[PDB]
């Protein structure tokens, strides 16, 4: 198919893997533990 | 040409003659990756009202996604250490889930329907299973290729057409998602192209020309389902594959 | 016993009483956007419609400039 | 270009056969729906959305074979 | 845990078939 | 009655306020991430998880 | 000129001019002009993809009519359960001291 | 705002990154091999024209 | 041109094979309806609308086939 | 002439769909038999549904049959 | 040159028959899902991931055939 | 170049064999669903047999796809 | 020898049609395997090697079919 | 001549389609075998030779399919 075979392969793959490493570091260090802080806080007020 | 919606156009531009710096430059694909990153950033940064415990109505969505992917990867790899592979099993979800809702917006563009990126991501996850399996379990990694207690005179056949299914796994996982997103978008654009030329003939067709419009509305209702289900099926197969690679059956 | 008592009153004494340091609003051109749409009781899903309209407008401008 | 346009019509004819999959498919889903309601009439509001979901997901595979015929007729 | 010809029980047998079809 | 004497903004208590009054929360979350346990023990029984399935 | 238009349309123009609007003389004074400019200059071509836009408008109408209050009720019930248990457990435990 | 927590993301995910570098390199060579075909040797937006050479154009 | 037209007749012939899916399927639905009434007769009034719904939705994928057949006849 | 020969070829092709009716009518009558044999008291209720299913599956076959006749004559 | 495009479109028409192997596939999976939920109402939250898994992991084999069709049509 | 056009017909015809593969994966997971629903305590016992049977059935659908790729690329 | 060289590839394409029988067959064998172990958990060690026996014995047909395909494609 | 030498290879490509009969037949035989052994364990010594007897001539019908391909492939 003509449209998914251009010269832009390295473009696609470069910004894609930059976004993957970005979201991986970003999710893992920032956004998943900001939910888990809510979890441990709710359970800590619940246990008291 | 109903497939012109996937054209990649360069916007901001950069070139040289010393070094090929044309790899990185802001492009339609690249701009929509920036948009995906800013949406995923927006779903967690300004969602949380002033770091409140109670977790306002927006945060219930990103609560439920978290919980339905924790309770999914606990029921697949489920061993001594399942949580060490949980950020990857979540960030493989959210990219595909957001990049298949952004693509539903009418004048927009499917990141997921580029086979060269998704097949590359699938081959990355497959080699990262084989290397991890070899590192963790030595030469006995190949014990994955014999199923169970089997009769020995038919074991090498059941090894050959087990390994063939083992490296079909490299491209199948990506090409499933690519085929679903590409076929859905191409279906919607072709039916829109047919109902447009249906409604430009004689004025009796704009009367009772509501039923093909309703059929296109029904297909758009179907297309969110076929877009979210694939985002879930990616994250269930690359949990099962880490079960095979980490734990030998 | 004491294990609950020197937990709970020691937790409670610096719990800020009247919801102090409220900071109900600010001025940064998005905190006013966060208060009207995203904070506590407003919470409505109209920013999805704003965002969808943004991509519709942007993609239509690009499609008109390139192909039409 | 008469040969390729004659081949377009034959290709649109061949790409009609895949609809029989959906034609048997929707029926197997609704047949299981009927045989599940008759065994237990209390589980209707739990089971019937899954029947509608299976209807949609098989009708998608039907339309994926219809769209190839619509390409080969005109596009 | 196979037993071929009452010998030492072989490891998993999987590498030898791949080695046979590799040299072809 | 010093517990009721300090009033109760639980509907608007900040997690930064709990981190400030308890560094034990921050240390428990940090070690719980380092070892890898994304599960929260005893959360699911009194609080519904609201997974889709 | 009509029966009730001189008050209803007046309140419509006032509500169109109630949010920091210096165009209170005519609310549609600049809008009805720019509509004519966009129509006559052919700025929006009716397209193949425009029918897809219209179906997306109808989809958003169906969502905002049906799925939005259902999700509002679901989120409000879960919010009530969170705040209720989180308040009542701490209250009934702190009252026993 | 957000407190960064030092989660281990390198002593867990190294073969994914090694595989990423390998697929990056292999797709680089695949792109260079595909950018010189008969169909795409006269598409003027390829990075050959920005450095030196011009128009083989013998097919 | 005869070569295009004859192939259009052939494609119209080929297309109608997919209607056997609907022909088997409508009958599978009604057969499950029959086997469901015979287990519990008090559920017939509930189940029969979904049986005629399954008839309609399975006739749909046969009439798409028939539509492609007529478009390869009179267009 | 090639077109009249292609008419007879396509008329031959379009009769394949009659096997759909030829199997499905039997599945309906089979469920009819297995329903009467399990419960004889429901026969007069069930039998018009079997007649209706026979008629509708006959119509689905007859669509292929009339496309075959249109390729024959018209 | 007409022969290449002609046989190209014929092969692209032929390579959509495999979707009838996916319509029936999704059908049998959701049919077993319905019959399994109906005969045991407390198994839904255990059998539903296997249902979605079997659904898409069976379609994939029809979508491979559709990609062979797309590489014929447009490549 | 009749062969360059006739390899495409072969690549089209050789893709029909996935018809068996899709129905096959369906029958395997259908029996798995029925087996879990009848006996709720058998999932962790019999689920690797289901994954095994799926892997074998796909590979024996995949033979047709690799023959199609050899015809289309070799 | 362009006609015979084309008929090589056409015959190699039409050869693997019968290979779908093995894909259905492995599935029917393992389907009865799951269905049998589901009734009796204690019959596994007898039935499972018999199941892999039936697997290979049904696999032999599809392998012979693929063998005739490679004979027509490579000689 | 090339016209019959092509037809040899095309007929050999045709004649492997009948192998799906054996590929499903061995499956139904061993499927009922597995169902019978799992249903009644102690009847295995009587039941198993009947399954081998059915497999023998079902695989022989597969060889009957395959021998016409061998006959037309080499003259």
């Amino acid at each position: 198919m003509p449209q998914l075979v251009p010269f832009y392969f390295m473009n696609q793959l470069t910004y894609g893997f930059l976004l993957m490493i970005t979201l991986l570091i970003l999710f893992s260090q920032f956004f998943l533990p900001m939910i888990l802080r809510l979890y441990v806080s709710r359970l800590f007020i619940s246990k008291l | 040409s109903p497939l012109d919606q996937f054209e990649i156009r360069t916007l901001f531009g950069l070139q040289s003659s010393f070094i090929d710096l044309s790899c990185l430059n802001l492009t339609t694909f690249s701009l929509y990756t920036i948009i995906v990153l800013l949406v995923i950033t927006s779903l967690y940064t300004l969602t949380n009202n002033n770091n409140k415990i109670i977790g306002s109505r927006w945060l219930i969505s990103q609560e439920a996604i978290y919980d339905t992917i924790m309770n999914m990867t606990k029921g697949q790899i489920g061993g001594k250490n399942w949580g060490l592979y949980f950020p990857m099993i979540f960030t493989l979800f959210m990219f595909i889930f957001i990049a298949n809702l952004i693509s539903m917006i009418p004048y927009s563009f499917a990141l997921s329907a580029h086979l060269v990126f998704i097949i590359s991501l699938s081959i990355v996850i497959w080699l990262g299973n084989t290397i991890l399996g070899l590192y963790k379990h030595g030469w006995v990694f190949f014990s994955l290729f014999v199923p169970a207690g089997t009769p020995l005179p038919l074991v090498p056949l059941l090894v050959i057409i087990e390994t063939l299914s083992y490296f079909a796994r490299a491209i199948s996982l990506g090409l499933r998602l690519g085929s679903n997103i590409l076929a859905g978008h191409l279906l919607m654009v072709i039916l829109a192209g047919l109902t447009f030329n249906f409604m430009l003939i004689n004025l009796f067709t704009l009367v009772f020309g509501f039923v093909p419009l309703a059929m296109i509305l029904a297909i758009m209702m179907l297309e969110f389902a076929i877009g979210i289900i694939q985002g879930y099926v990616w994250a269930i197969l690359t949990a099962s594959y880490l079960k095979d690679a980490v734990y030998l059956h | 016993p004491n294990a609950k008592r020197i937990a709970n009153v020691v937790h409670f004494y610096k719990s800020l009483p009247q919801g102090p340091a409220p900071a109900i609003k600010a001025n940064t051109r998005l905190a006013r956007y966060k208060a009207k749409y995203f904070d506590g009781d407003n919470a409505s899903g109209k920013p999805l419609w704003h965002f969808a309209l943004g991509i519709i407008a942007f993609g239509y401008s690009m499609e008109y400039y390139f192909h039409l | 270009m008469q040969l390729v346009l004659a081949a377009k019509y034959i290709g649109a004819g061949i790409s009609t056969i895949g609809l029989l999959g959906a034609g048997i498919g929707i029926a197997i889903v609704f047949a299981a729906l009927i045989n599940g309601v008759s065994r237990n009439p209390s589980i209707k509001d739990t089971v019937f959305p899954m029947a509608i979901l299976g209807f949609a997901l098989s009708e998608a595979t039907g339309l994926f074979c219809l769209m190839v015929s619509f390409l080969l007729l005109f596009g | 845990y196979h037993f071929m010809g009452k010998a030492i029980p072989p490891h998993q047998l999987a590498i030898g078939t791949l080695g046979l079809l590799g040299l072809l | 009655l010093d517990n009721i004497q300090s009033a109760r903004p639980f509907d608007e208590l900040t997690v930064d306020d709990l981190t400030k009054i308890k560094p034990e929360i921050d240390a428990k979350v940090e070690e719980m991430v380092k070892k890898g346990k994304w599960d929260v023990p005893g959360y699911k029984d009194r609080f519904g998880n609201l997974n889709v399935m | 000129k009509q029966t009730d238009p001189k008050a209803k349309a007046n309140s419509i123009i006032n509500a169109i001019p109630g949010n920091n609007i210096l165009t209170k003389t005519g609310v549609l004074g600049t809008s009805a002009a720019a509509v004519i400019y966009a129509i006559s200059n052919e700025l929006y071509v009716i397209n193949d993809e425009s029918i897809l836009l219209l179906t997306f408008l109808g989809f958003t109408g169906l969502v905002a009519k049906y799925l939005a209050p259902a999700y509002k009720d679901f989120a409000d019930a879960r919010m009530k359960k969170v705040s209720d248990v989180l308040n009542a457990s701490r209250n009934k435990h702190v009252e026993a001291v | 705002m957000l407190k960064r927590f030092p989660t281990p993301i390198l002593k867990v995910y190294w073969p994914f990154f090694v595989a990423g570098a390998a697929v990056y390199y292999g797709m680089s060579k695949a792109a260079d091999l595909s950018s010189n075909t008969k169909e795409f040797i006269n598409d003027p937006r390829n990075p050959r024209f920005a450095k030196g050479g011009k128009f083989v154009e013998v097919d």
Side-chain angles (χ1 to χ4, degrees), chain A, chain B, chain C residues 1-17 19-23 26 29-68, chain D, chain E, chain F residues 7-53, chain G residues 5 7 9 15 17-18 26 29-89 96, chain H:
Chain A
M1 62 185 291
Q3 194 49 248
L4 304 181
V5 193
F7 303 100
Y8 294 100
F9 288 174
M10 186 50 71
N11 186 9
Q12 289 175 356
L13 196 145
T14 302
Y15 285 104
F17 286 171
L18 285 174
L19 181 136
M20 286 299 173
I21 301 168
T22 303
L23 287 175
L24 195 145
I25 298 168
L26 183 139
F27 271 122
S28 178
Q29 293 182 357
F30 291 153
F31 296 115
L32 275 70
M34 79 175 288
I35 306 173
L36 196 140
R37 285 177 67 188
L38 297 168
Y39 284 113
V40 178
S41 67
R42 288 174 184 175
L43 193 143
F44 180 72
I45 299 170
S46 178
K47 294 293 183 183
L48 186 65
Chain B
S1 65
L3 196 136
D4 292 332
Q5 59 176 352
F6 301 106
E7 294 181 354
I8 300 173
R9 276 75 167 267
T10 172
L11 269 68
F12 183 74
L14 191 57
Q15 67 179 355
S16 294
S17 182
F18 288 164
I19 192 167
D20 192 359
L21 199 57
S22 176
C23 71
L24 60 93
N25 46 355
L26 185 145
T27 324
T28 52
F29 184 79
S30 181
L31 192 143
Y32 278 137
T33 57
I34 270 93
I35 285 179
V36 168
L37 177 59
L38 290 172
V39 168
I40 293 170
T41 311
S42 178
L43 288 176
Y44 295 101
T45 304
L46 42 83
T47 292
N48 192 359
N49 47 354
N50 65 16
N51 293 321
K52 193 184 292 292
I53 291 170
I54 308 300
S56 295
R57 294 179 182 176
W58 282 90
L59 198 61
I60 295 171
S61 178
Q62 302 297 319
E63 176 72 23
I65 295 171
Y66 177 81
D67 288 325
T68 194
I69 293 166
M70 171 187 160
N71 287 319
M72 180 264 287
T73 191
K74 187 172 71 176
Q76 296 299 111
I77 53 175
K80 184 183 288 185
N81 46 5
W82 60 270
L84 274 74
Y85 295 94
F86 180 68
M88 186 183 72
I89 204 69
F90 195 79
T91 190
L92 285 170
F93 181 79
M94 285 299 290
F95 173 74
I96 302 173
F97 176 72
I98 297 299
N100 288 322
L101 292 178
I102 289 174
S103 179
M104 295 293 118
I105 310 299
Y107 290 102
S108 177
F109 182 78
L111 283 79
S112 297
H114 294 284
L115 270 302
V116 181
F117 171 62
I118 297 299
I119 286 173
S120 173
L121 188 63
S122 175
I123 291 172
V124 164
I125 298 168
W126 178 68
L127 285 175
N129 285 319
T130 63
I131 299 301
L132 181 65
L134 287 178
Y135 180 78
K136 192 179 286 291
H137 293 283
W139 290 97
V140 80
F141 174 75
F142 293 92
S143 174
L144 188 147
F145 292 154
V146 287
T150 58
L152 196 145
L154 51 86
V155 167
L157 187 146
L158 192 63
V159 167
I160 292 300
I161 59 103
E162 183 69 29
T163 60
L164 183 61
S165 176
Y166 186 73
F167 66 88
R169 182 178 292 176
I171 57 99
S172 175
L173 177 59
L175 198 145
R176 178 182 297 113
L177 193 147
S179 304
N180 275 305
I181 302 301
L182 181 60
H185 284 286
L186 196 61
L187 177 64
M188 288 188 290
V189 175
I190 288 165
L191 260 73
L194 193 144
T195 60
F196 185 73
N197 290 321
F198 177 68
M199 292 174 70
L200 265 68
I201 60 102
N202 299 114
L203 186 64
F204 292 97
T205 189
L206 195 146
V207 182
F208 60 90
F210 181 73
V211 278
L213 191 72
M215 182 169 69
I216 290 176
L217 178 59
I219 291 173
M220 184 179 285
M221 289 290 286
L222 188 148
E223 193 68 29
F224 283 19
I226 206 66
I228 298 171
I229 286 172
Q230 296 299 318
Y232 180 73
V233 167
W234 183 274
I236 189 69
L237 268 79
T238 184
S240 177
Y241 293 157
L242 269 72
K243 178 179 73 177
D244 283 334
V246 172
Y247 296 150
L248 272 303
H249 289 284
Chain C
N2 290 320
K4 189 179 288 292
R5 187 65 59 86
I6 71 170
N8 62 11
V9 300
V10 177
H11 177 72
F12 279 160
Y13 73 88
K14 204 187 283 186
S15 64
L16 275 300
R29 280 79 176 272
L30 273 75
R32 294 183 291 113
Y33 183 78
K34 185 169 74 175
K36 187 171 72 175
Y37 286 163
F38 280 143
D39 287 341
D41 203 6
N42 297 318
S44 291
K46 292 187 289 295
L48 296 177
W49 175 251
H50 295 291
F51 179 76
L53 187 61
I55 288 180
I56 286 170
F58 181 74
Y60 182 65
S61 67
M62 187 179 292
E63 181 67 28
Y64 178 70
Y65 182 73
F66 287 159
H67 185 71
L68 281 77
Chain D
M1 293 297 109
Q2 300 300 107
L3 181 62
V4 62
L5 200 145
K8 283 182 182 290
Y9 290 164
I10 300 296
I14 301 293
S15 297
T16 314
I17 280 94
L19 291 171
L20 70 92
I24 304 168
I26 306 306
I28 293 171
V29 175
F30 283 154
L33 176 62
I34 292 168
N35 290 319
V37 172
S38 296
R39 290 179 183 269
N40 192 0
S42 66
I43 203 164
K44 184 70 169 175
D45 291 332
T46 304
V47 169
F48 180 69
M50 291 179 181
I52 297 299
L53 184 65
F55 163 71
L57 293 171
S58 179
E59 189 68 28
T61 304
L63 291 175
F64 288 168
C65 193
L66 184 63
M67 59 173 284
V68 177
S69 180
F70 281 156
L71 281 176
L72 291 175
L73 285 173
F74 300 105
Chain E
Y1 291 162
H2 299 283
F3 293 99
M4 181 63 206
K6 297 298 290 183
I8 299 299
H11 44 277
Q12 63 267 12
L13 197 144
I15 306 171
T17 304
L18 295 173
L20 179 62
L21 275 78
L23 295 175
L24 192 146
Chain F
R8 182 174 293 167
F10 278 163
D11 291 330
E12 62 270 14
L13 183 59
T14 307
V15 298
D16 293 331
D17 198 1
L18 285 180
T19 305
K20 184 175 73 68
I21 193 58
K22 299 296 181 183
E24 190 270 331
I25 298 297
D26 196 4
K28 182 174 172 65
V29 171
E30 180 64 35
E31 192 271 330
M32 192 181 288
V33 172
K34 284 184 182 179
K35 192 177 290 296
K37 300 189 294 294
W38 294 95
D39 194 359
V40 178
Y43 183 85
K44 189 257 183 64
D45 54 356
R46 80 278 309 279
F47 288 159
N49 53 2
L50 48 69
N51 50 356
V52 173
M53 43 80 202
Chain G
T30 62
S31 177
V35 169
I36 296 299
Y37 176 68
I39 293 300
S40 177
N41 203 5
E42 196 182 6
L43 193 146
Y44 181 78
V45 180
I46 54 170
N47 200 1
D48 189 354
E49 201 166 4
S50 64
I51 298 173
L52 196 66
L53 188 143
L54 194 149
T55 57
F56 181 74
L57 293 177
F59 172 72
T60 51
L62 291 173
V63 170
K65 186 175 176 64
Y66 292 160
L67 276 74
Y71 179 70
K72 183 177 179 180
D73 289 331
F74 177 74
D76 199 1
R78 185 72 177 99
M79 196 71 70
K80 185 184 289 184
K81 184 182 287 183
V82 170
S83 179
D84 179 73
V85 178
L86 183 60
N87 196 2
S89 68
Chain H
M1 189 183 72
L2 277 74
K3 189 177 186 295
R4 181 170 180 177
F5 287 169
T7 76
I9 53 98
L10 187 60
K11 67 183 183 184
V12 182
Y13 293 152
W14 74 88
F16 294 136
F17 293 153
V18 173
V23 174
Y24 185 84
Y25 186 77
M27 191 59 72
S28 177
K29 287 187 179 294
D32 288 333
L33 193 146
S34 65
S35 65
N36 294 323
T37 186
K38 292 181 182 179
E39 181 69 27
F40 291 155
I41 202 164
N42 293 321
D43 189 2
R45 63 188 184 273
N46 50 1
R48 181 180 65 187
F49 291 162
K51 47 174 68 178
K54 295 180 289 292
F55 283 161
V56 175
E57 283 183 348
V58 178
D59 288 327

